Design a protein around this ligand. Structure first.
Ligand SMILES: COc1ccc(C[C@H](NC(=O)[C@H](C)NC(=O)CN2CCOCC2)C(=O)N[C@@H](CC2CCCCC2)C(=O)[C@H](C)CO)cc1
Ligand SMILES: COc1ccc(C[C@H](NC(=O)[C@H](C)NC(=O)CN2CCOCC2)C(=O)N[C@@H](CC2CCCCC2)C(=O)[C@H](C)CO)cc1
Ligand SMILES: [Mg+2]
Ligand SMILES: [Mg+2]
Ligand SMILES: [Mg+2]
Ligand SMILES: [Mg+2]
Ligand SMILES: [Mg+2]
Lengths: 195, 196, 204, 222, 233, 222, 212, 196, 195
């Protein structure tokens, strides 16, 4: 796990998530996709404790997919993020909490707005123009504080992201093996393949 | 805390000091450590005040229910109820209790129940922090079948010494006399017992 | 490790002449990292205002819970809950979690709609009610707020004066606390208008 | 295990004017929940127009003051009776504090007097001898209550010129000794209200070119 | 680094119009065992000073030897040793305070709390406290241990600030002290009935009373107290 | 806290200071430590603030229901038994230290309860951080056969000793008097010996001093 | 704290904030974190306040003695090594220092050395040091070019510390700026974040995370 | 360990049990705890056996050197040398020593030196683990100026009881009589003292 | 610190040493040369505790340079490595030991042989065909066990090294920022600049 970032521009939300999976002194995998599609216009990235991360992500996915079928309708990004928050807020007071931090990027089709929610394992939710979990945030927040503009295009957003990934590859002590980038907009979710 | 119970010709006497401390502070200098669980079955309490009160209250309730159904319980029976509570809950209790009562068949009896919840029937018993200081004295001076006035003097002299050496004992000396005649409460103030 | 100072934040409330004020900062951090600049800590249920400092997940959770409970109250009672009553509901709710508490410092502010009395109260994390004539303070800069309030405050300030007083208490307290600040919001509350103002403050 | 430190409570406060400076402290002395004394001075005239307070653990505070007073005496002996300037006192005190870097004096120290141009000076130190000159400083138990009030009322922080759309700051300006004493007395009564270790008495030492004057005020005794 | 073994409890004291009073009981406890019964914890120094000591008794006995060696040392090559160059209470105090703070600073304290009471050569009352940390303070009343908690509040009702000292007589002060000693005997589990008391007056000099006793104790109300709540007999 | 109870001729009186603390800070300068369990049974509480308040309300509620069920005036020994058994069950984790007093058809009563569930009987009692200062006074002035006036004086004197000498107590004295054959009389702020002196200065600001970024009207209606 | 220093075409930029902390208590907003050792030597301070002040003013004294004994100003290399050898002696005792020794000599050119209380000594072109170092790095690295004009380099340095002052709870107060050239160091003012943040927001149009 | 020393008309007697234990094992059942540091100055030792032997050996050496230079040392002087060693080395010693001797000027004297190295001159003294059990008894039965036969009986009865209750005391009762007449060693076996 | 490797081929010793210097979550430097020349035909690489590493390296350098001047002669690689071992064996029982591991690569001009010594902070010395300190060894030893031949050229040695660095960049969790490579042979010590 380790690096997950989110940026919300004019008409989309972009999630970038590192590909490395490490145990001890071995990088076991360098193409890991730290993400699950919850609904056609909502994507969730995740980082934290081994095992917990995927188990939690897939559990949320199953619940949202179940809701979709039952009502023949897609929950808004805000509604999904509140559902997720509540699950984590329950979890933190369980016998064994989920040690998982998430970013939820969705396009709200009723409002025609992109939306980015940052939620930690405590169930601490915040809606943001850009977000990060882990040590990443210690570089990217100030970088984005400087270079980010509210009206940027998807393409300007991707360049802003390249800046972030460049800084992280320069200053971060670990080799996180690059990122998988996904765009969420009015047409759903797609993956950029050469990043 | 210094406590004792002594069998004698006509029955049994219980005695205790009246000090309860929180560390070195005396929280109560006129405590009553002699507690009734039946008309002529009493106990003296040592250890945690909360624990021994909780126990004595439960025992009093058991013996009042025993009485309703089966008549007056024996002193042995009362000691068995104390033991059951002390033994089964030994991990969570700090209680050292002396049980004393008067049957008409059995005369005076004394049972001591130390920390682990074992039971010991004895001619007399001493307990509490102050008791360590009077093992020598009490062993030397106790005789069986003493008189009421002899027994009161034994207890008064014994607890006098426990009080003298133990900082956790003090105040007044209370006693409860248990005979066929009834129940008699005695009290003895410092100015009397200090200069024996 | 100390849940009351992971996220940061402050809330203060004051009485005036037929008015009350309640204010809060906007910071949400993760220890040294400032994360959000828009995290408001004051909510309202009808005309009763609640500020909550402490662990942000519990701030959010308690807001959702008190919205839940006050909505049902209104449906069953057929009237808005008053501040005195709401204060009691906050207390019982917190104490019900006596041995696994919410890590929060809530603050109630409002005017009783029958009596016209301004009303403020504070609580510890376990429900102990602190009712006060003058002011209530809460959060990571509570020492600082106690110092500001105890010297700046005087009884019976008019709404526009109380605004200046409460705002200065909050601002100067926040600037002496690493985990508080990053913006502020002040509510001026009179019998039937409520004005909400965002203060300009240092952004470090 | 033996703990070589204690906490004797109280709080102190220093403000500098244009041609004077004050150093104030409450006169209460405590351990745990007990009052040791309602009048035990902890602000001292050290000679050469320097006043000093070292507030926190009183045994450490007294030791430090004694060592500094003695330092002043030897400065005279060694440098032909020259006056020890406030900046020189402060640097000397840094070395006294830093000499015990690994077994600190548990005190927050403030000194006040006049700089070499006759202007009021307040210097303050952390327990191991970090220091800075300012207009303004509170130290000790209630420092966190009093300091932000001083930022607002001595240096006009967060105060703008009305009607300027928060674009023009209230302009900095020195305060009269009368205005300063008002802020000191209000600071301490406010602190006495909310902090259990602060009360009983307030003793202020004022420093001008004519020397050191004292004023004393009663504080609440609960 | 240390732990007190044989200990003495409170030392209480106050100023009055012409002097100072100080008292301490005669017990040396060994934990909860009231081990030793004739222990003098007020130590006079010359005819103008009494040093009252609580805490570790082995360290108290060391401090006695320091003080008695101080007297000897002060007499050396001093023709005014019983006059203008006699030991003042303030000299004796500063010496003890110096020692206490040095010993705490070497992490090997003298495990004591000390009150130095006396009259200076100009007639001024002296009363100052020092303990194992080398903390020092002065007040119209001073007490150590339980004394600080129970005596000070009583003695402060008599002398509550500096200006109450001229208004307080030696009869009033001694009475207040003797009453405080009774209260401590009721309430402190490591106190004894027997105590010593000393008055140092600018006119009458040092009066040192031994073998005092706590008298006039109320215990009678004890006969009415039965059980711990519901018990009637 | 400081709290006390004193028996007299024809009843019982309890009293308390009005300070509440969080660490060294005074959280509330005028809290209420006297609690009504039933109209003629009142409770003074020291310890964990919310625990004293909750345990006192719970038992008060159950006492009311018991009183209705039995058609009798509630007894102090019932409140005592319910409180002790509740506190014992929680093994001291509910940190309530209580003085329980009142009058009932059986007479007048005075007890104390510790957090682990042990109880005492006495003619004069004190609990809390200030209990040693209060007990010093009680042991000095208490006698058999006190009048109502003497008892009120003794009790408030005992609280005063706590207010002045214990940093854990301060502000005001509250009293409640429970006399046989009369209504209980609760004397809220019976003594107020700690009124703040007048401030030296008004800190009311020039309007517009505070820089504002935005405004809006909040909708509190429907 | 946040501190930085970088080499470029026009010499060296040095920028620092001015906050002092005692845990979450803001101890000061106006603290000096650069020591002017001589007209060609600056030292930056991060870590324990007393450790930094005490040992860096001590460093200055040692540098002064070098020039009395050798009739020549000390090299940046040698001055930095006096400090690193000093703290290495204390290694394990718990000193806390993160410092940059920045200056110009003719034999070296403009030179920066990172020195910390672990005993690490590094020559390099760019460093940021302190609790806010990562925040400064993110801005500094993503706009740095060797060819910045003196005017742009000064701004970037100022803007980087501002970034850290905004996001790092343990940085703030004001920015202090220096430029070091072949003719020595030049002070470029104190810039209170109270005003600088809002000014930069307006003129640059950045800080869109903030309620405007 | 149970030890005591008692002044009387003609001088002083020291007594001790003879048990030394390692935990519950009796390492030596016939120990001699009464040790000579001068002709008529002896001590009884309790605490760490190694510590008290090391101390007594050093004291014996000091008093033999004192004697060479200054003549016979007083019992007070001997107690002062013990104290100096016990007080100055309090962190590293576990020693509870009773000093007893006979001057011709001073008659019998007893000084007790408990754990912290304080000194206490007394008419009699008791120490060791077993002593706790006979505080009451000894306080009641001791009188000043008893005879040799009375004092031997007091000690024999006292240590009898200490031995009875304390598992760490036992074996024989040894005594040393110190008078103008010289030095007399007494021993008393279980079969005598057990049934007093 | 972290990665230091050594390979001894037919006629030279090659040392490769990582360039990263890291503290917390910041790579402070990416061109660090973790090496000191002890004499014209002897090179020492080092890794371990911050500060300790350089202080130890330079202390050894000063001693060997002093010996060289005094005798006008160059100590053999074996002699130097024994001197170094002894310093570390003393150090490990000091109040504060040097926490430094070293590789010593030298060309012995009397024998005309390259020599590689691996010495840890305990003063544990071993002469080896190839060596590594730290987590590196857990990959490179088995790799070299397979691909290494005793008679390889300097150029074959460099290729063998590229294989090592490739594996480490693939499987190691940290970004060590490449290596500086130095060759020690009959003509002294030189640095390869494009690796
Ligand atoms: C175990 O930790 C404790 C225990 C007791 C106190 C004193 C007490 N203050 C409080 O309870 C304050 C409001 N709350 C807290 O300190 C929060 N605590 C956090 C951890 O668990 C306990 C709750 C307080 O003020 N007690 C008063 C009496 C109160 C006053 C308010 C009305 C109810 C009774 C009194 O006992 C004196 C001041 C000291 O206790 C603090 C911490
Ligand atoms: C070893 O423990 C440490 C290390 C670092 C700090 C932060 C430092 N603050 C202090 O030094 C404060 C004023 N004083 C103390 O913390 C008191 N002493 C700490 C050392 O042990 C004895 C007690 C501080 O404010 N550092 C500033 C940089 C200073 C500012 C003052 C001038 C010199 C440079 C900076 O690093 C940011 C604010 C992070 O601290 C505290 C304790
Ligand atoms: Mg229990
Ligand atoms: Mg006693
Ligand atoms: Mg702030
Ligand atoms: Mg900041
Ligand atoms: Mg106060």
């Amino acid at each position: 796990m380790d690096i997950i970032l989110g940026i919300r521009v004019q008409d989309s939300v972009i999630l970038a998530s590192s590909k490395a999976v490490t145990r001890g002194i071995s990088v076991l995998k360098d193409s890991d996709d730290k993400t699950r599609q919850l609904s056609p216009h909502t994507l969730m990235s995740f980082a934290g404790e081994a095992g917990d991360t995927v188990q939690f992500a897939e559990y949320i996915q199953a619940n949202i997919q179940l809701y979709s079928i039952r009502e023949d309708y897609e929950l808004s990004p805000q509604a999904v993020s509140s559902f997720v928050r509540q699950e984590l807020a329950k979890s933190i007071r369980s016998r064994r909490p989920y040690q998982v931090n998430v970013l939820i990027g969705g396009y709200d089709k009723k409002k025609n707005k992109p939306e980015l929610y940052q939620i930690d394992y405590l169930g601490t939710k915040v809606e943001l123009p850009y977000g990060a979990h882990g040590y990443s945030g210690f570089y990217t927040f100030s970088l984005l504080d400087h270079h980010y503009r509210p009206d940027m295009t998807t393409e300007e957003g991707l360049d802003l992201l390249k800046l972030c990934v460049q800084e992280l590859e320069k200053r971060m002590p670990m080799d996180f093996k690059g990122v998988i980038v996904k765009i969420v907009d009015k047409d759903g979710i797609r993956q950029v393949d050469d990043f | 805390t210094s406590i004792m119970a002594v069998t004698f010709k006509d029955g049994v006497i219980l005695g205790a000091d009246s000090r309860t401390t929180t560390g070195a502070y005396i929280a109560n200098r006129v405590t009553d450590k002699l507690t009734r669980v039946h008309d002529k079955i009493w106990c003296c309490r040592s250890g945690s005040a909360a624990d021994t009160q909780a126990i004595a209250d439960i025992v009093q309730y058991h013996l009042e229910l025993y009485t309703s159904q089966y008549g007056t319980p024996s002193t042995e029976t009362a000691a068995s109820v104390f033991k059951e509570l002390c033994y089964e809950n030994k991990d969570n209790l700090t209680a050292g209790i002396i049980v004393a009562g008067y049957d008409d068949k059995n005369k005076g009896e004394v049972y001591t129940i130390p920390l682990g919840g074992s039971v010991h029937k004895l001619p007399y018993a001493i307990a509490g922090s102050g008791s360590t200081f009077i093992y020598g004295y009490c062993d030397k001076n106790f005789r069986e079948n003493m008189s009421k006035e002899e027994t009161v003097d034994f207890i008064k002299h014994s607890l006098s010494q426990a009080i003298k050496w133990d900082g956790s004992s003090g105040g007044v000396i209370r006693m409860v006399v248990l005979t066929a005649a009834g129940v008699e409460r005695l009290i003895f103030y410092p100015d009397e017992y200090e200069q024996l | 490790s100390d849940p009351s100072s992971i996220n940061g934040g402050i809330v203060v409330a004051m009485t005036g002449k037929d008015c009350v004020a309640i204010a809060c900062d906007l910071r949400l951090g993760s220890q040294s990292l400032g994360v959000s600049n828009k995290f408001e800590k004051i909510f309202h249920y009808g005309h009763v205002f609640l500020g909550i400092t402490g662990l942000a997940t519990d701030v959010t959770t308690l807001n959702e819970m008190f919205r839940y409970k006050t909505n049902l109250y209104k449906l069953k009672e057929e009237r808005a809950i008053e501040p005195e009553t709401f204060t009691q509901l906050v207390s019982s709710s917190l104490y019900e979690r006596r041995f696994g508490p919410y890590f929060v410092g809530p603050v109630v502010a409002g005017i009783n709609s029958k009596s016209g009395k301004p009303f403020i109260a504070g609580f510890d994390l376990i429900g102990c009610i602190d009712e006060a004539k003058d002011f209530i303070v809460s959060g990571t800069a509570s020492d600082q707020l106690f110092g500001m309030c105890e010297s700046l405050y005087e009884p019976n300030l008019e709404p526009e004066d109380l605004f200046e007083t409460i705002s200065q208490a909050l601002l100067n307290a926040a600037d002496r606390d690493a985990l508080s600040g990053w913006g502020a919001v002040v509510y001026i509350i009179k019998k039937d208008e409520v004005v909400k103002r965002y203060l300009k403050m240092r952004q470090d | 295990q033996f703990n070589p430190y204690g906490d004797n409570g109280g709080t102190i406060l220093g403000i500098a004017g244009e041609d004077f400076a004050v150093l104030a402290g409450d006169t209460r002395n405590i351990t745990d929940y007990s009052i040791n004394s309602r009048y035990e001075p902890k602000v001292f005239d050290c000679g050469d127009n320097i006043v000093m307070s070292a507030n926190g653990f009183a045994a450490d505070g007294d030791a430090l003051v004694k060592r500094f007073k003695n330092s002043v005496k030897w400065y005279h002996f060694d440098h032909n009776d020259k006056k020890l300037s406030i900046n020189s006192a402060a640097r000397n005190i840094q070395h006294l504090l830093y000499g015990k870097r690994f077994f600190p004096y548990y005190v927050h120290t403030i000194i006040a007097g006049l700089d070499e141009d006759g202007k009021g000076a307040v210097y303050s130190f952390d327990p191991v001898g970090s220091y800075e000159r300012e207009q303004c400083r509170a130290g000790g138990a209630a420092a966190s209550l009093i300091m932000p009030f001083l930022d607002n009322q001595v240096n006009f922080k967060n105060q703008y010129e009305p009607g300027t759309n928060g674009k023009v700051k209230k302009p900095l300006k020195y305060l009269s000794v009368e205005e300063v004493i008002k802020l000191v007395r209000d600071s301490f009564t406010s602190a006495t209200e909310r902090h259990i270790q602060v009360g009983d008495g307030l003793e202020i030492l004022i420093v001008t070119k004519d020397g050191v004057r004292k004023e004393f005020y009663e504080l609440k005794r609960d | 680094t240390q732990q007190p073994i044989v200990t003495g409890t409170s030392v209480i004291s106050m100023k009055y119009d012409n002097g100072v009073i100080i008292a301490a009981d005669n017990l040396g406890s060994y934990g909860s065992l009231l081990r030793f019964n004739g222990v003098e914890r007020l130590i006079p120094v010359g005819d103008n000073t009494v040093v009252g000591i609580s805490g570790d008794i082995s360290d108290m006995q060391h401090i006695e030897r320091l003080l008695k060696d101080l007297v000897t040392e002060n007499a050396y090559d001093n023709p005014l040793a019983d006059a203008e160059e006699a030991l003042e209470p303030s000299y004796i105090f500063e010496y003890l305070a110096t020692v206490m703070y040095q010993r705490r600073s070497k992490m090997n304290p003298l495990w004591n709390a000390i009150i130095v009471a006396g009259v200076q050569s100009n007639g001024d009352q002296f009363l100052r406290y020092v303990n194992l940390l080398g903390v020092t303070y002065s007040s119209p009343t001073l007490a150590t241990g339980f004394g600080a908690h129970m005596a000070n509040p009583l003695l402060r009702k008599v002398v509550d600030r500096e200006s109450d000292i001229p208004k307080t007589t030696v009869q009033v002060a001694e009475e207040a002290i003797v009453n405080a000693m009774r209260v401590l005997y009721y309430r402190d589990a490591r106190s004894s009935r027997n105590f010593s008391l000393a008055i140092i007056d600018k006119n009458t000099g040092l009066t040192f009373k031994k073998n005092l006793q706590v008298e006039n104790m109320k215990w009678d109300f004890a006969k009415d107290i039965k059980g711990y709540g519901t018990q009637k007999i | 806290t400081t709290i006390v109870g004193v028996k007299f001729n024809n009843g019982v009186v309890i009293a308390a200071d009005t300070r509440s603390t969080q660490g060294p800070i005074v959280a509330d300068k005028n809290c209420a430590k006297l609690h009504r369990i039933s109209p003629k049974i009142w409770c003074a509480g020291a310890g964990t603030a919310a625990d004293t308040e909750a345990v006192t309300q719970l038992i008060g509620s159950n006492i009311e229901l018991h009183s209705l069920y039995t058609s009798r005036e509630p007894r102090v020994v019932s409140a005592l038994q319910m409180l002790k058994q509740h506190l014992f069950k929680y093994q001291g984790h509910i940190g309530a230290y209580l003085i329980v007093a009142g009058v009932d058809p059986t007479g007048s009563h005075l007890f104390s309860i510790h957090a682990h569930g042990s109880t005492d009987v006495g003619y004069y009692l004190s609990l809390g951080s200030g209990s040693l200062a209060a007990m010093a006074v009680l042991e000095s002035h208490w006698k058999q056969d006190l009048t109502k006036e003497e008892a009120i004086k003794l009790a408030s004197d005992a609280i005063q000793a706590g207010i002045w000498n214990d940093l854990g107590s301060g502000s005001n004295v509250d009293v409640c008097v429970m006399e046989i054959g009369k209504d209980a009389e609760y004397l809220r702020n019976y003594l107020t010996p700690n009124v703040r002196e007048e401030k030296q200065k008004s800190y009311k600001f020039p309007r517009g001093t505070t820089a504002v970024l935005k405004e809006s009207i909040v909708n509190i209606c429907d | 704290t946040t501190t930085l220093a970088f080499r470029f075409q026009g010499g060296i930029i040095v920028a620092v904030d001015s906050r002092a902390t005692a845990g979450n208590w803001v101890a000061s907003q106006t603290v000096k974190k650069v020591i002017e050792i001589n007209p060609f030597l600056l030292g930056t301070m991060a870590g324990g306040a007393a450790d930094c002040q005490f040992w860096e003013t001590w460093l200055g004294s040692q540098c002064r003695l070098h020039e009395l004994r050798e009739k020549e100003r000390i090299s940046v290399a040698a001055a930095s090594k006096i400090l690193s050898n000093l703290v290495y002696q204390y290694k394990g005792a718990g000193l806390s220092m993160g410092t940059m020794i920045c200056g110009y000599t003719r034999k070296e050119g403009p030179t920066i050395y990172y020195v910390d209380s672990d005993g690490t000594r590094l020559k390099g072109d760019i460093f940021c040091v302190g609790s806010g170092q990562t925040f400064a790095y993110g801005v500094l690295d993503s706009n740095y070019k060797w060819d910045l004009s003196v005017e742009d380099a000064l701004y970037l340095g100022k803007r980087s510390i501002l970034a850290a002052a905004h996001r790092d709870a343990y940085s703030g107060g004001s920015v202090n700026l220096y430029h070091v050239t072949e003719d020595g160091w030049i002070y470029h003012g104190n810039h209170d974040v109270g005003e600088l943040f809002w000014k930069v927001k307006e003129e640059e149009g950045s800080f869109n995370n903030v309620i405007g």
